[PDB]
Amino acid sequence: NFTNINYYKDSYAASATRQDFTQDPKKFTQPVLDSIRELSAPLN
Amino acid sequence: NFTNINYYKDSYAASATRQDFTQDPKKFTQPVLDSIRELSAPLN
Amino acid sequence: SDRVAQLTVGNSSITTQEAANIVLAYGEWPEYCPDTDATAVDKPTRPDVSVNRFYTLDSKMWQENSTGWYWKFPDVLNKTGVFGQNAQFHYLYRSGFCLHVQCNASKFHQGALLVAVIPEFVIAGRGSNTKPNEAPHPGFTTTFPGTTGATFHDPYVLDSGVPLSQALIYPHQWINLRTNNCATVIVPYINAVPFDSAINHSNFGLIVIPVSPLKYSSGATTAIPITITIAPLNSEFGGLRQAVSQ
Amino acid sequence: SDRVAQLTVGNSSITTQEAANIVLAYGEWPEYCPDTDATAVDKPTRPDVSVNRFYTLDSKMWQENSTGWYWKFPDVLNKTGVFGQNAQFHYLYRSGFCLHVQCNASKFHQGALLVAVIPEFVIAGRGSNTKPNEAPHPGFTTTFPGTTGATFHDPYVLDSGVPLSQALIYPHQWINLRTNNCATVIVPYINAVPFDSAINHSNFGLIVIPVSPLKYSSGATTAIPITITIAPLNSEFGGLRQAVSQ
Amino acid sequence: VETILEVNNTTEATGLTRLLIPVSSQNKADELCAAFMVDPGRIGPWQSTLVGQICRYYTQWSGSLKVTFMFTGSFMATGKMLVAYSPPGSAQPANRETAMLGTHVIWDFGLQSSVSLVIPWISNTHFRTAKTGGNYDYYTAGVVTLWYQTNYVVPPETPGEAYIIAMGAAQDNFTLKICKDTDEVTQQAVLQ
Amino acid sequence: VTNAESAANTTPSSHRLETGRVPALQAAETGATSNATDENMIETRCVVNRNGVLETTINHFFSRSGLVGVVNLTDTGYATWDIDIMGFVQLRRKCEMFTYMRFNAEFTFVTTTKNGEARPYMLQYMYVPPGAPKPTGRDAFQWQTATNPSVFVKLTDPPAQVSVPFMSPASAYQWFYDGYPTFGQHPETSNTTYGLCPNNMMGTFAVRVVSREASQLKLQTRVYMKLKHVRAWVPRPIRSQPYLLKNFPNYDSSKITNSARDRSSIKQAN
Amino acid sequence: VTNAESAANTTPSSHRLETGRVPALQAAETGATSNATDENMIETRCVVNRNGVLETTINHFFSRSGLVGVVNLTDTGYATWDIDIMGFVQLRRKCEMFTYMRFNAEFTFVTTTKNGEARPYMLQYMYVPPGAPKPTGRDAFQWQTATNPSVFVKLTDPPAQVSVPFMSPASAYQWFYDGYPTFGQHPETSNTTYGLCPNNMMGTFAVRVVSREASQLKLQTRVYMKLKHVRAWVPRPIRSQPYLLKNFPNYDSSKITNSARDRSSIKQAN
Ligand SMILES: CCCCCCCCCCCCC/C=C/[C@H](O)[C@H](N)CO
Numbered sequence A, B: 001n002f003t004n005i006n007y008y009k010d011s012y013a014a015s016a017t018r019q020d021f022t023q024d025p026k027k028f029t030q031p032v033l034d035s036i037r038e039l040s041a042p043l044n
Numbered sequence C, D: 001s002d003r004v005a006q007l008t009v010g011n012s013s014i015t016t017q018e019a020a021n022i023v024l025a026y027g028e029w030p031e032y033c034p035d036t037d038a039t040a041v042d043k044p045t046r047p048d049v050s051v052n053r054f055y056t057l058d059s060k061m062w063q064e065n066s067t068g069w070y071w072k073f074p075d076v077l078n079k080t081g082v083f084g085q086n087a088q089f090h091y092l093y094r095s096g097f098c099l100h101v102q103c104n105a106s107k108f109h110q111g112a113l114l115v116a117v118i119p120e121f122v123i124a125g126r127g128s129n130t131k132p133n134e135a136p137h138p139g140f141t142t143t144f145p146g147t148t149g150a151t152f153h154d155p156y157v158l159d160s161g162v163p164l165s166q167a168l169i170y171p172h173q174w175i176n177l178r179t180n181n182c183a184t185v186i187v188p189y190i191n192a193v194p195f196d197s198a199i200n201h202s203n204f205g206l207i208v209i210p211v212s213p214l215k216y217s218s219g220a221t222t223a224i225p226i227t228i229t230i231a232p233l234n235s236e237f238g239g240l241r242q243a244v245s246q
Numbered sequence E: 001v002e003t004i005l006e007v008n009n010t011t012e013a014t015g016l017t018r019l020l021i022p023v024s025s026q027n028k029a030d031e032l033c034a035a036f037m038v039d040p041g042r043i044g045p046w047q048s049t050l051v052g053q054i055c056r057y058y059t060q061w062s063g064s065l066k067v068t069f070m071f072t073g074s075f076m077a078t079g080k081m082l083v084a085y086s087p088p089g090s091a092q093p094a095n096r097e098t099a100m101l102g103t104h105v106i107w108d109f110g111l112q113s114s115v116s117l118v119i120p121w122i123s124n125t126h127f128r129t130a131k132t133g134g135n136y137d138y139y140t141a142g143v144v145t146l147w148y149q150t151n152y153v154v155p156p157e158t159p160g161e162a163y164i165i166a167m168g169a170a171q172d173n174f175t176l177k178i179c180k181d182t183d184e185v186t187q188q189a190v191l192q
Numbered sequence F, G: 001v002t003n004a005e006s007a008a009n010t011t012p013s014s015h016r017l018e019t020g021r022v023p024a025l026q027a028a029e030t031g032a033t034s035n036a037t038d039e040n041m042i043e044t045r046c047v048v049n050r051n052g053v054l055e056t057t058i059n060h061f062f063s064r065s066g067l068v069g070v071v072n073l074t075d076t077g078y079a080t081w082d083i084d085i086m087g088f089v090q091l092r093r094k095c096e097m098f099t100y101m102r103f104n105a106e107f108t109f110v111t112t113t114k115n116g117e118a119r120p121y122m123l124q125y126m127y128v129p130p131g132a133p134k135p136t137g138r139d140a141f142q143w144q145t146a147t148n149p150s151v152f153v154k155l156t157d158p159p160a161q162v163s164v165p166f167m168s169p170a171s172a173y174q175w176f177y178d179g180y181p182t183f184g185q186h187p188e189t190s191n192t193t194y195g196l197c198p199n200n201m202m203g204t205f206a207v208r209v210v211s212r213e214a215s216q217l218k219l220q221t222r223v224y225m226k227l228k229h230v231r232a233w234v235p236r237p238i239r240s241q242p243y244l245l246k247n248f249p250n251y252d253s254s255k256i257t258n259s260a261r262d263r264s265s266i267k268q269a270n
């Protein structure tokens, strides 16, 4: 499926480049310093 | 990025050829004969 | 081993006997500016002792029918200490912060607070006027309150047209008067430019809205204060010139 | 290769086309305080860019019948720049200096100046009174002149009972209006204690006494100024607290 | 390449005494000689140089600048100057103690009759739009001032009035982005 | 950092009868989202999930065209439009979901007539960067476009389309700016410059009909912007109040619209 | 000769306290630019510069189209245009920045009507080299173009575009010629031939409407030239005075426009 092909020297005129599935939910859901387990009481 | 491709025998009908970064500022900024250092007095 | 804590930064220390955690904002530590992201040529200064310490502001009374308070973070400290002198003589500023909001109460008081940081917390002007030149705008002592803070008029919309209910997408904590008494956030330097002035642009802002208002019985302590202590972690300045107040 | 020179310190540079040398005071360089000689426990601050640069004072007219001028060295810079803020907020101070006194004149003027540094240059009170409580003492704007300097009343005794003839045991130079126009001294930190305040104690003092007074013919330039530029080499401060002017 | 600035572009300067900074002898100390803005895409002295006509073709510039002062005077006339660059903030300084708080240089008229003050790249953003005025005072570069450091001393039988020729150029890290058209050329009808 | 498609599958679980292991009791006072999952609460089965999450990235969410501005040309002879995409509340809210954004663009120009038609005339679209002189007439010298990028297209042509790079002096576009652009004495009554980021002023977009006399038509060109190669930072809540101004987040003091519709009681789901 | 992109980065520097090493004292009397750099004057830090200088070559600076001439056709039946690009002050000043230039060209032909429209007629563009006979009518025999290059294009077509090589008898195009084309007794009063380089006369450009009777329209064709494969030599200062003539650098004796706007005093930056 040739779609990435460009026709100019400027790289900002191309299509939607490689789709990387990067996902780091640990920075919005668990930002606390001390790593808490999920099978124990949060505050001992 | 195929752009250099021509379609005639005449070479003056092509696109903007290879971009060479040639730069010699030493002929407009320091044209004197005796090479002067930059950490000494010009006229000893 | 999780509720007691001590936070020594500089010649100041903070002791507490019941906290919950220390939320790290966006899971990142306050760092120094690398040589890759830097753009200014002049060498920056780093006091590293006199500016990285806990500055304590005045106390805010927590009345039963309170609405909330908000402070700008590089602007609360411009006349206090060596940090204000450094952020008045220089022109560029980059640092992270280290928050701590204390509100102690007995085991017979109830209530809660939502403390959070809001990057680029822009104050909206209140009033129905869809005309560019006739619209109302907030004053200078409302956008930049200073060290005495500023109260909310409509805490339900954060005075910016944004719901408070979904204001938990920000680095935040709670002060539940039955579990903890202190909320602390370690926020890094969040900006679109590597360096920025500490007099025209306020990076972010703390908000403390009292949800589930304070309640108690007769005979208990009525005066319930609220104290916050800031620490400018990893401060560095650049562009030394004449001192400008504002 | 000996008369032209350039002295780049910080974001300031000094160019000259005819000097004689650069006397190094007591053959030593301004260093940082080692861990052996240090006594304070708190970590010192080091701006290293904003305070180590050439500060230029106002110009002094050189009249024909002039007597001389003198300045205290950690006291001329307490309201100017980031160095004054650092030496007002902090309590301890240690640095060396880098002197430069310029006085240019044509090839038809004659005269000379003696520029020197005097460690612990104590100003004496003039007057014959051998009674402890009735004796005269110099004012505060005479012991610590500030950035506007102070003139001598008797330059022959350096206003301290000490002959000027044998004042060549001090790091010094001459400004002979036929040979050079600039005298520069690089003085290290000379004191009996490792650190000292920069508001109560003035380490040393420059003196510029015009020996062989200025002479010229009619039609020449009459206004002959005298400009001095200081550079606080290797400045470090300690003991951050509230700012005190004096 | 160095190129003479029009620092004397004030009124009452006739045709060619607009390139000269007059120097003479003073009576009060700490006097001031001249002052001009740094912005090369701005109306003023930089409009007459070669870097301020090339940075007017482009709507963005970056890097350090360079100002070279040459003293055209008698051989027997000595003196010293304090040329000082000041990053943005307040207005032009009023005293020499305020001016010496920036990045100055102490230049003395000797055998070498030319000094060069490099203007460092002290900015927040990577680039600066070469169009100041209005809401574009966020891209100002500062003020260069030249002060009567000590005095202009002259012997008898010698003129007590000289001139300094200011020149300006770019540096090694100078660069430009996004071409445009200058505002100089005006044309009503075709050139027949 | 984990990189995977589909969706996290579940695992088989049994009942737990023991003390000290409590996955359900969380503590929201720590500012952390609860981490209790399906398997630990209830007895579950094993499933292999194949429900692709490719359509939920911030690069498929923004890579959709959308009206940014409309330009009415009467034929003064010309018409201008200061480029600012915060004028229509459909693409403004998705961009204001985030604080900082870095992206390329792709504008599409759709020009129609008063009643709606396409007469075979010629149009010139010219982009005026900040600092370039705006045209003062329909036959001025600014239209010579010796350096400004211009597009010559007819009404009977397909809609024009160009690609625009990241043209900001900062490292990203910020929509919310908590500060002033300049120094000085700021007033208490009318702060007409608070929250005005100078890194977003991109210039002026001008349009004229290429002719010599005056063409008797009232046109209307719509600018459709599409985002691509977009990166986003520092998410923030989505606005619930109706918009009033264009460059300011002003809302209405009275008649604040609640973020949830009303029901009869709190013990009645429906 | 050094070849590199980006920009020269800076290096860390410390303070210098010594005699004999003076990087600041230059000497402009030698006709050389000063070589003092950042590191030697002030204490600096280390930075890695990435600010690309690709857009500052003389091949990206000139490779931009631009109006060179306009040809009014009344329909005499035909219209001619002597090829000389020094008629509009926008592309004339960039080319007069240099003394010698060697380049290829690319002309674009944009033809409109009186009020501005595109009627489906036919146009013939014919290039007449120096020596070829110019056409004397709209139905003459010169239009048979048995050897001259011609373009047949309609008004409803896209604008025509051809490529033109370096067609000069010398090795480069010179804009300034300090001499006379011929020998003989040159006059003192009216030197109407001084500064006239014969190596730049390229011929005549003619245009007609291909028909038999007379078409009742007043057209106007604009020639947009773009330079490419351009080499430049011997740079020279850019002109500050307003242009008066087309082939001559004449200016105005009185009311000479200063190259810098006036201010109040010399001790007031603003
Ligand atoms: C005539 C054809 C080319 C037209 C060029 C127009 C595009 C130039 C402007 C770039 C737009 C960048 C995207 C929006 C930028 C800022 O976020 C807006 N000012 C938002 O206020």
Ligand SMILES: CCCCCCCCCCCCC/C=C/[C@H](O)[C@H](N)CO
Pocket: G083, G084, G085, G086, G105, G107, G125, G126, G127, G149, G150, G151, G162, G164, G167, G173, G200, G201, G202, G205
């Ligand atoms: C009808 C289609 C072909 C049209 C051919 C026209 C191009 C032929 C002329 C070549 C132009 C070369 C560029 C300009 C040359 C000289 O510099 C000018 N005379 C400047 O005065």
